[PDB]
Structure formats: C-alpha cells, structure tokens
Structure 1
Amino acid sequence: VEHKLCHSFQTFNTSYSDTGLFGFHFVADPLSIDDMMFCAQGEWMRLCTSTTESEVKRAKNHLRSAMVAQLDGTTPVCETIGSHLLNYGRRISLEEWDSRISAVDARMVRDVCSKYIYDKCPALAAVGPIEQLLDYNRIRSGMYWI
C-alpha cells in the first residue's frame, strides 16, 4: 500500500496426495515487479527467522474463521466431506482442526517454514511485461538471510 507495489497478491498452500506447492502470486505494473518480489521474499524470510507470538495469535484467529467460512452452506460442507474422505482418509471435525491450530506457536512456525522454505530452490513462472524482474540466481539468493 505504501509503495504501490501491486494490484493484488496472495499466499497459497495447494496440497496433493504425495506432494504440493507452497508459495505466492502477485500482479503488478511492469515497473514495480522488482520491489514487490523483493519485499515478498523478504516476508518469507521473516517467517523462517523472526516470527513473533503476536503475529501467530492473529494468524490463528484468521485461520479459524476461514476454517468456518469453509462450511457456509450445504454445498461447501458437502465439498469438505467429499474431499476429506477422498484425501485425509476420514472426516476431520472443526473441533479437531481447532485443537491443532491452537497447538501452533512461534517456534513451531519458524521451525516449519525453515523446513520447507530456507535455502530451497523455488519454481518461478512469470507472464507479461516481466523485464524488471530477473535472474533465477538472484531470486534464488533471496531464499536465505533475513
């Protein structure tokens, strides 16, 4: 917002049977792709190294509500049930989800993000007037230190 880095951006944790994709996606003007990408990786590194208890508290409450808005209708609840058996094996209750979500804290987030993010070789996809964003070698070095 301050710097007008983008038009939108979003984190995402797409999961699959045996694998997955954990990342983010932003849309921006040709001339600000660089700074956004810069701030973005920056915030990832801030996850693996200096997450606070204040940040996680809110994080949990935000997840909880999204977890409930997941079941706002018969279609959504049916979708949850359909995909739970098919993927997680059985059905996972909100009371359960919520217990797991409360178990989380700073140390946990850091130790986990560090597990899947720190010093990893990421996959990149750029489309459009992407000249300002550049070099894998650079983006790669954004995967450590912060």
Structure 2
Amino acid sequence: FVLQGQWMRLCTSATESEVLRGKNLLRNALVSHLDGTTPVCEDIGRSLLTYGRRIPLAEWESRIAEVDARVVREVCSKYFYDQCPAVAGFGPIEQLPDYNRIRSGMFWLRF
C-alpha cells in the first residue's frame, strides 16, 4: 500500500523540497561510489560499453541539476502511472495483494 501510494504521490504531487534531497542523495551516492581504482575502472569499462563514452562527473551534475519537482512528476508519471507492473513473490505470501488490486494501486482515482 505504502510503496504504491508513494510512487503515486511522486507521480502527481512531488513537492519542490524533497527533490533537492533526492538530487543531493544522488550526488553523494555518485562521488562516493567512484572511490578508488576498482569502482572507477569498472565505471570506465562499463560506460564505454553502454554509452560509448565515459560521462564526466560534471555532466552528471548538470543532468542532476536540471531535475526539479515537475521533472519528477513528469518522468514518474511517464514510467509509473497506470502501468502494469511485474510482480515476483517468494515465501509466506498469502497476503500478497491480488494482481488486479496491485494494478489498481498503480493509479489514483482522485487524480
């Protein structure tokens, strides 16, 4: 319920403030991730496969800095809103919501 209602809140009514938090959290993840020979090497190697470049940290900052609440509500709604999810479930899963009811969770009636 809570995970789904989160997705939807962010689809519809992402405030300005939390997006700056996420932006910082992401910057902090990024710099911190590229710590020492092994991460940076892995990121060189992978990046050239997947982007055909290495994308310089400043470019990521640029790409991050662009994003705000609208850029969230937009890009969330595009991917999340009223979309069929894939669910996988394992172990004691009697109470795992029926798929219809999960898929109902993928949009708000109020919106």
- Whether TM-score is above 0.5 comes out as yes
1:84 corresponds in structure 2 to 47
Counterpart code for 1:86:
L
| Cα RMSD, aligned residues only | 0.9
Q: State the identity %.
A: 72
Structure with the higher fraction of residues in strand conformation: 1
Return 5+ residue gaps in structure 1 as ranges: 1-37
1:105 corresponds in structure 2 to 68
| Residue 20 of structure 2, aligned match among 54, 57, 63 | 57
1:121 corresponds in structure 2 to 84
Counterpart code for 1:71:
L
**Which digits, 9 at most, give the CA deviation of each residue in 1:42-93, with x for residues without a partner?**
1000110010110101110100010111211100000110011010111100
Q: What does 1:1-146 correspond to in 2, within 5 Å? A: 38-145=1-108
Distance 2:76 2:53 in 1: 27
**Which digits, 9 at most, give the CA deviation of each residue in 1:92-138, with x for residues without a partner?**
00011001100000001000100010000000000000101121000
Distance 1:86 1:65 in 2: 24
Pairs aligned (count): 109
Distance 1:83 1:44 in 2: 29
Structure 1 stretches (4+) deviating beyond 4 angstroms? none
State the 1:142 CA deviation. 0.2
Higher RCO (CA < 8 A, seq sep 6+): 2
Counterpart code for 1:47:
L
Distance 1:134 1:66 in 2: 33
